[PDB]
Symmetry: C4
Subunit: 23 residues, 4 copies
């Protein structure tokens, strides 16, 4: 559902933040 989609996107956004900080 919408909650599950939101929660997976939150994981996606945290991984993106780590990747960009590792530049």
């Amino acid at each position: 559902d919408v909650e599950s989609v939101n929660q997976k996107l939150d994981d996606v956004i945290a991984a993106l933040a780590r990747i960009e900080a590792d530049r």
Copy 2:
């Protein structure tokens, strides 16, 4: 606070930054 749509736009923009950084660095 962010909608699904806003999060997807954030993901798309972050990937655009990563893609440019990797492409520009490999030169």
Copy 3:
């Protein structure tokens, strides 16, 4: 809607594919 979410995820997956191929 669900269609818009799917279409944005398709853009996300294409960008990921380019990033990984640029390794």
Copy 4:
């Protein structure tokens, strides 16, 4: 053919590969 949920799992896995590659390379 892929659901939203399957696409999100694909995105999460691709990011895990990118994250490991960048972290391991910076060493």
